[PDB]
Amino acid sequence: MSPNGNLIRMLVLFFLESELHEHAAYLVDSLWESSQELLKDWECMTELLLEEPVEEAMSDRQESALIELMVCTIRQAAEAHPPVGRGTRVLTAKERKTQIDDRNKLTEHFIITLPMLLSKYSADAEKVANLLQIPQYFDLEIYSTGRMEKHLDALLKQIKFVVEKHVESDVLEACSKTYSILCSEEYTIQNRVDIARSQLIDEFVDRFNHSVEDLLQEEADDDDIYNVLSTLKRLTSFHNAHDLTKWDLFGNCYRLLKTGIEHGAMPEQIVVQALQCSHYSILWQLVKITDGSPSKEDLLVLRKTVKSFLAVCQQCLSNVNTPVKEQAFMLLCDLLMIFSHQLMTGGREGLQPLVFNPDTGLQSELLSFVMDHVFIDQEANKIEALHKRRNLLAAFSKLIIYDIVDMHAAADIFKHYMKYYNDYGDIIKETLSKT
Numbered sequence: 001m002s003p004n005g006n007l008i009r010m011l012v013l014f015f016l017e018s019e020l021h022e023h024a025a026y027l028v029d030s031l032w033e034s035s036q037e038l039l040k041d042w043e044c045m046t047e048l049l050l051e052e053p054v055e056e057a058m059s060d061r062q063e064s065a066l067i068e069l070m071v072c073t074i075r076q077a078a079e080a081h082p083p084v085g086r087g088t089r090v091l092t093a094k095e096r097k098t099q100i101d102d103r104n105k106l107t108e109h110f111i112i113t114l115p116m117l118l119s120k121y122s123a124d125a126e127k128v129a130n131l132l133q134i135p136q137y138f139d140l141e142i143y144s145t146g147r148m149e150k151h152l153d154a155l156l157k158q159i160k161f162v163v164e165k166h167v168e169s170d171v172l173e174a175c176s177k178t179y180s181i182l183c184s185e186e187y188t189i190q191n192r193v194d195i196a197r198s199q200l201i202d203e204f205v206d207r208f209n210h211s212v213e214d215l216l217q218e219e220a221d222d223d224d225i226y227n228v229l230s231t232l233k234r235l236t237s238f239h240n241a242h243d244l245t246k247w248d249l250f251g252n253c254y255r256l257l258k259t260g261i262e263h264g265a266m267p268e269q270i271v272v273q274a275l276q277c278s279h280y281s282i283l284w285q286l287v288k289i290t291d292g293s294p295s296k297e298d299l300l301v302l303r304k305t306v307k308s309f310l311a312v313c314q315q316c317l318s319n320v321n322t323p324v325k326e327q328a329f330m331l332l333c334d335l336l337m338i339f340s341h342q343l344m345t346g347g348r349e350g351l352q353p354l355v356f357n358p359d360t361g362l363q364s365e366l367l368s369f370v371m372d373h374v375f376i377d378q379e380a381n382k383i384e385a386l387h388k389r390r391n392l393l394a395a396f397s398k399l400i401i402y403d404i405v406d407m408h409a410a411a412d413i414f415k416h417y418m419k420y421y422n423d424y425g426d427i428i429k430e431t432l433s434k435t
Contacts, residue, residue: 004044009058011038012066024065025083028072032082040077042106045070046113050120060124067121067130074110077102078137107139108146115154122161125168132159132174135181144188152182152189156196163200167230172237180241201238205247207231212252216259225267228256232273239280245288250281250305254312261315268321275316275327278309279334286338290348299353310335310356317365322373326392329369332362333395336404363405367413370396375417 014020021027031039048058049066058066072083080099081089091099114134121127135155143152155178163175182193211227218224235249253274260266260274285302292298313335316328339356358366374393399405415422 001044004038004041005048007038008041008044008048008066012062012069015069016061016065024068025072025075026086028069028076029082029086032076039073040102040105042070042073042109046109046117050113050116064127067127071130071133074106074134074137077106103137103139106137107142110134111138111142111146111148111151115151115158118155118158118162122158123165125166125171128162128166129170129174132178135178138181140181140186140189143186152192156193160196160200163234167233169233169237172234176238176241197242201235201242201244201247204231204234205249208235209252212256216255225270229267229270229273232270232277236273236277236280239277239284243284245281245284250278253278253281254308257312257316260319261312268319268323271316271319271321271324272327275313275324275331279331282306282309282335294350299351303354306335306339306354306356314362314365317369325369325373326388329366329373329392330395332366333399337398340402340404358404366396366399366405367409371413
């Protein structure tokens, strides 16, 4: 009770204090065979996280680490296998029965306690993003079965408070994903969650629209800027997993971008988000068209929307801020692959009017960005900036392979930037072997 509390408080200290386990998941996995009973005392963990003290209270850092370990125990219990990168996986009767029982215990426990956890820690971005990894392990049928509707409501209240208070992309993404899980995966509760979701979206679309109008009619305020960006972020996050085309967000995103090109003064993050949001709108428009039976004018309205957006992305390569160039570049490399002739696979030759071929100017501009922003002269931020430039080249590499850009001008660039490996590498190679 308070016994298991001490073992857990110390487990959390050994985790934070030594460098013997870098990853919470690996710590948990390695103790799993020996300490499952302790590691599934979730009642004890939520008690530790939610009680007020007597002596000696937990620190912010230790609270975070307890939340992180708790979530790993929830995963491991629900999946009944070691984590990603510790696997090798057939269960006995008793392991299968333990899994079912564990899922039942954790679902009941956390339906009740996750809203309490979110309430308490609501302002802490990192913690709330961790806590929001829990619902994915829920046996969601239990929200009907336990006459547990009051607790579904509580989670939704608490998710709504989180989205309203936070702009971090991890938080918003976690929120978006949690609505997803709550909806589509049990009919009973689908309708209740859909209502909360669309009310939430409605409120943010109204605030976004008012702010877009404020900003574009106006000289322009730090508040006007903040209101556009802050609301645009929430909507951009949700627009990936949720089809928000019913609200015409492409149109206002488009004006923001067109104004930024014209007068040169749209703040970089507004441009980046606006690009992202438009892209998600377009992808969702495309899905409705693939899955439907689309008319001639349906296709040509989508085409016009896509040509205007490709045009904006092209224009945005010349934005001073390199985060905008990179976003435009990624979107060009995505969209030029999606609205290539690939689109006419699977008896879908009706889509031909949606096919785009990048002009010569654009292919050249897409060559320049590689030259200037992949292949660059000159801690942790630099291994991450490398993978980013890798992905940028990698998305460009797809266009080369299907001759969507000039494959020859591209290889010429790859020749130029590999020269020192061709001209001296054999000599460097053998030199380095003998040391």
